[model samples]
Target: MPRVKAAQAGRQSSAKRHLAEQFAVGEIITDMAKKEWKVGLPIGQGGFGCIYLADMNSSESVGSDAPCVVKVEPSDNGPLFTELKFYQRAAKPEQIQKWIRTRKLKYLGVPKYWGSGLHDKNGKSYRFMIMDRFGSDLQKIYEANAKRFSRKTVLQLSLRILDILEYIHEHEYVHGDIKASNLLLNYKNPDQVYLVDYGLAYRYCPEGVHKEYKEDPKRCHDGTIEFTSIDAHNGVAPSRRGDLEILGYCMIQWLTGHLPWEDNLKDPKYVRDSKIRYRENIASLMDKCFPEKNKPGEIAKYMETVKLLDYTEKPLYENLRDILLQGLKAIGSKDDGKLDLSVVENGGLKAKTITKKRKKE
Candidate 1:
């Protein structure tokens, strides 16, 4: 009926804006159970929801300890819900929240789901999920200077992700979404990397069990163009190692600021035929060099060497050049290198464990 009315009204733009601003931040309440609330500052909007800076104290304290990000999902969802549904059910909010608390972690350092319930604003009932409020997206940091992160900073970021990846892998669940866009940056401390937007997360059996099929593609793709491993787009059920591959790309991007997979996108095909080729390419490239699977200091040394070779002194850019050069040699063309090696099975190629041949003199 709303669509019909929208059709009759001929207000496509207004409808889109309406959908964008679909849910209103009716009121801020001291307690949700009390049904006492007031209007909140609009933070952002999405397809199915709008995020608001909801506070416990008066508006004067909006900048302090009382603020929580409330994501109000429309009965009609302007757009964000397409990606939010998965997180709502993955693991209960309390379970996730307690895990964060027990770890002595900050909210944005890892979004500890506070609670979720229907938010009543202006007599309208809407499902809303409450979690930690962040100052801004990582996109802001990337856009502001792009050079704000040093090589050490980038490695630290990768380490934080590695910690999370190790945790999830232990539980036999793949994050299924690991990218810069999904990462929320807390101005309070950029060192703290919070993994957000878990809508694409799900549990999987180990490597062999990932062969099972399901109908959901977003559960598989998660809109990743650069960070996603090739096996993901090829309809291969995502594995823990595949998740590591995606995070590896993000680590490289954080240091180098370039997409690992570029040529494949020039005239990319979306179906199975070309997707398989692209996947093979991705699988091959990642097999040889990804930081989480490779030693960091060695990779850094190689990157520095490449930079000297290129007559470029910028640490990150040089690292990227070396990364691409290595990736190309390993998997630039189809059927070039081994694509089926298991990262976890080999236990991530620790440099410390590599044995050297004893010299006999």
Candidate 2:
């Protein structure tokens, strides 16, 4: 890993000053969309209203027993309704369902939409809707595994995430909040990865999610601090590339026990000052996926080997090392000091095999 003083590592302390200066929060409101969408007990909370598990078997126009989940928001007094309106107008559940049906692509991981409408709670209007629900989040999956996975398992997980993100990106959308907690897996089997929390998600853009952020930076407040991209912390909206950067960090967290931003483990103040160390740590692991300019890449590789399989594949170390070295020589990933596997792979990362011959005495 490259060694540099914390000061040398550039990170703006007050980059998001505008948000602090122009803080705007609408009143919190609650209303269920249409009664066609029946909700069960509260499942979780959103930017404004509470999300609930929906009953799929209900004999309504928007009822189904297949895999699904729903998010309800209060429309009377807050941004919850505003966000709901955006989703409803853009690609709400039913629209997504129609898109999925028309495209005939794999829609299992996507939450199917049932309905949305305004409901009254004590005469207060609230926004509510129904969507597909899954079993558990990836955070739970990581905890279940004790924050350890095999090399193959790690690769498999990366591939799945990458695939989903790539697909989502190609569709001109960006899943802004890509963290272990937001990803869900099947209830019976915790293998598949599902995306959640679109409250902050928006169309992909090169300059980042500028329009959305400019419209409301408060929406930017919804991401996990540890998994956020540097640009995002700088008050920039989300982009496809930014989303991918978050995914890279998430992959590292799964492969190793450390978080790039450490926000989940600690508070924002500790993270802001200590970001340099965090960047160095993440950069070190990212160097593993690259072949060149990573002197301490071994630390990351060794950790990946250890954390994944309990270090059982000792014999494969030399081969894996060679692969990484060769990958570094390849086109390799690049970033402004962030983990980006796509950049690494494009830069020259690849999977390789090395064989050794035994001598007979």
Candidate 3:
């Protein structure tokens, strides 16, 4: 696998050579379904591609009010290509809709796959995917509040992410990377957060058989340095347990503003070793991260629960939710479907109401 991975790394660095060519505003591109989409101005430009506002072919031009975003890159780009496959396999609108209806839940955070296709411009080929537009990401909110999310916000966010993680895991994919930046608030409904990027999605179980866990050195340290799972640091194939463990760290960082291993992220072995120790002794993790006696009880329980899962075992997700729900109840709160991300006065626990708050640039 490392031999194969060396070739892949070579190809990946070569990908740095070309960015996607920009398309003119109001240009029309057709999807594989032959559905016509009008591309608008570029709203966000990234290291390798551009995100443009897009709309279904209509009389009016696609503008600020466009409901969709088209991410475009050269057809050879790996991330978008991988992402396209995940969306095609699991993120179709009907699939997400069916899951919601069957579960009787409010909504899953997974973005709907609208359409995607190859586009040719000036004899160059580009791949594009159209998905729902979103507002600001959680990272922005975390920064605005100086890296601390209130307890209510942390629980709501973790619960929502757990919902998404379970959905993706059930669909046989694992989000190898889950962090604040990947969590996006809905443009029209800010309360509804969406897990946007699937570039690092991995199919852990193919054809209903769980992949045997193995360590491949090439895959070591494969996620965000701070919040990545310990399994990733050990080069183990990502699994459902890895995703839950990663989410626990995210919730910990959001609630406490830092993790015990955050100070030495540059040294992967140290971070990995430290994580192994804490995971072995959940009490040590709670003691270090929450030195005060007033630590959230759920954090300790959640960590232990996830740590107990075997590489190929299916997690009892509802039981984990019960643990977090207990924390919410102890704090005089419930899962009222409110994700209070705003940092207001009195406490960082203000109800996010629809007002001029979201429109601010």
Candidate 4:
């Protein structure tokens, strides 16, 4: 155990902002192209409707299983306002289609940004965006699988995430936060997954130049504590390496079902120290997180590759994918494009209790 100075760490406080007000079912909203959409039932959240099922403009009511969902907040809501730019800049449906065509990819895992516009209600303005609705997030599925995803599933999911990272990075934004909860399964196609909730999205590069590396205590630790990058921990702006480093942690956790630092989440110093210590000795981390004889060597290699990236350097995304590809080969599998998401392989730990259970600007 470590003594945590709650005073100095300041405990990751974000703005205490107000929630968005509700929009009524059957309300019609229009996108930039003047295409109207019909809002349906509320999905979740209180203090009014935050998300709703939606469909193309129709006299018919929006069904529970509408292909799209609408996210609404006040005109200047911090996170939504932030998220919208990422979509506008890089996530439009046409933009995604173009990437898939140019890269010859079967598909990219980023959620397609359909459309967005301002909607006024009660004489107050609201900002709203519509996107493809997704199935269960990876977190729910991880718990369902008794904490561990089979090695095949782990490699497959990480490969898809790598595609997303490359796309978002190429477009001059860094997701900053990458975790299973933020990775959503395709609503119709179980084999496909998508990255959503870009509230922490950062335009690290604007007009084709990277931001210089600098640290600020006030800006320290701006992402999910368990998987945040060392740069995030040190209060520096997130960069491409930060996303990869975060992905490395996610890969380890998905394969093993837990992180060594997770038990002490409230202690920021302890978590950051352990990660810094582990980056120097990833083999030791593999030892600590995985069984002695069943360690996944490729994970160690992934960390080493990420350790090599500079603050402003672009990642060799293909190289990172190739490394994980070899892991798939090692597991007697190949990129069959199937995320056989399920229980452990070789060895299994006792499943943790059902889940219950960060950022600055």
Candidate 5:
């Protein structure tokens, strides 16, 4: 929604006017739980909002000392609205329960949505969302681990990520941004990873209806410069294949340390142009990113397979995952879908080891 239209719609203002109004350290925000959450400090800021570390007044539900993260933004902001919409569709308790029951999965990698609502604060409409806090993202871990992940680690992570993608895709949505920075490890369990930041998520199919592919220059190159798919560059709405393409880039970078287009990020257009040129010839791109005697690696083949997918076609998620598994087997690595945190620790990745915290009796 446009700013003017949003402001004119109702008594709720755009919330931009009160951006300078700061919440204090001891400030409290209430949710449907009617629980008081004390703000600590601003932990991070993204394009649309700010995040804070908060502590609940009473931890009667889980634990008294459990920490949470809160996302605060103008109720009219694009990121917050889009994120909340996606969560409303897929993150509710009942929705999660049904999904889990149907799939028989022990855990869904998506974050647990505690609550969300619009708040009237300092005469502005601020939208806030509360959720379980997580630890550092894959990007930070990747850098601390010498900017590379082991073959076993990459394959394992790929399967975990792909499973999440399969679930989201089944719901008819695609995460437009699928890079390391958006993939986060659980704070309580290092073995569990979640895909965060749904600001760029877009739905390609709704009620089993696929959207048409149309070219629009305005939306070209809208996502991360280094890892966005060629379809995004063509101004096409994101699809399952697009997500897979972005994932392929991430996998290649995680395994090889860099992408062929990394150097061109200073100019998004240049990166888009590079991706366009290389979309047809994964061999050429792989040759630059990873070169062994002659043959392109399994990662390259994975990208090639994704490129073959049509915009409206359903992807074989398990088949794509199998490609990664085959790659692991070819490299003499076991195919067990377990995250070997030992590899991360041995690689010197900086992250706290998961230790279940005991609550005070």
Candidate 6:
């Protein structure tokens, strides 16, 4: 055990050193967009590499003066390639415009892809992607709100994220990672949440193509431990069902402050089994966590509906939306299509009041 731990630590240290050698604080790198950006400081690091806040030389393509973020990773990283390709296809100007016209949505929720390219530093090539900058993620907001959100607020967030998922799904992609950390609030408008980080996004059901389900050991459990889908656990490619299942898990956490498998994270097999258990017995699961305000049983309905979908099946998005609508009705709330985090903190009316008082008679 000690030898295994030492080997793991050694690998991690080597990875950190390699990442540190990728770029510097004052480095200026040009991208495929023919734009030069100056790297200011390190924002954070992921499994692949470090992310930095970049100042663009010009804002012609990005449309505004707002600074953008550049994700730097080793040239051999595969997820960055996948992300760049998906962005090129889905985040184009015309694609975004078409979505706005069709859905009549105020915001598209997906981040704008600025550009990507290769950078050479210290004789090593690093791939980097430039994208629209965002503010704090939903996890921070969730923590600030006492780790749980109001039913109304959760529903509102759900609709926004669902819109994003629908847009990506229409482009034949599934965001394999749908946890709160990847959901970012727009810097300009906290009400507007954007789904950032497409590193785990996959082409699930491209037009004229049906996906085959064949498990691969290398691909098993390829996402965040908490909310990854059963298909992911089984090493199958992510699809519409997988995306919705992960979103359902996020919704459960936001609405109830915990998932059935949160306690079993250290043991991946235990977590996987617990998720299966909850999905198989959703009614009992909900009854345990959300005993009181579950008139419509939306969480259970959503999970069951997604579970029924085949690997390559298209989701009934509208039907799923209807289930959440029923939940809003059960809670005496309506979908105003606005997110008010204050509601999560201060609470909202638990039920409806139709009668007017007689003013003390």
The 0-to-1 C-alpha lDDT of every candidate, in the order given, reads: 0.47, 0.46, 0.70, 0.69, 0.65, 0.66
Minimal lDDT window, size 10, model 4:
347-356
Runs in model 5 with CA error above 4 Å? 1-29, 33-65, 121-123, 217-221, 267-269, 294-297, 335-361
Ranking by TM-score: 3, 4, 6, 5, 1, 2
Best by lDDT: 3
For candidate 1, the 10 contiguous residues with the lowest summed lDDT are: 345-354
* RMSD vs true structure, all candidates: 15.7, 17.5, 9.4, 7.8, 10.0, 12.1
Model 3 Cα lDDT, one tens digit per residue, 54-109: 88888777657788777766675455566777777688878888998988997778
Candidate with the larger TM-score of 2 and 6: 6
What C-alpha lDDT does candidate 3 achieve relative to the native structure? 0.70
TM-score of 2: 0.53
TM per candidate comes to 0.56, 0.53, 0.83, 0.82, 0.77, 0.77
**What lDDT score is found at residue 355 in candidate 2?**
11
Say which prediction, candidate 4 or candidate 5, comes out ahead on lDDT.
4
Sort every candidate by lDDT, greatest first. 3, 4, 6, 5, 1, 2
The candidate maximizing TM-score is 3
Over 1-361, each residue of candidate 4 has an lDDT whose tens digit, in order, gives 2566433634575455444556687898778768788888777644343567788876777776788777666664455565666676677778988999998978887777678878675666877777776666677767776886777777777767777777767777666667776667665577777777654566656787776787743442445677767776787754567777777887788777788887899998999888789888878988877778787768877888888776656677777767777887787877664765432211100101111112322
lDDT tens per residue, model 1, 59-112? 443542334666666543422343334344433466567666776775424455
Candidate 2 C-alpha error for residue 172, in Å: 3.9
Count clashes in each candidate, considering only residues at least 3 apart in sequence or on different chains: 10, 37, 0, 1, 0, 0
Residues 235-295, model 6: lDDT tens digits: 7644456777777888878878887777778998898777777767777777888766543
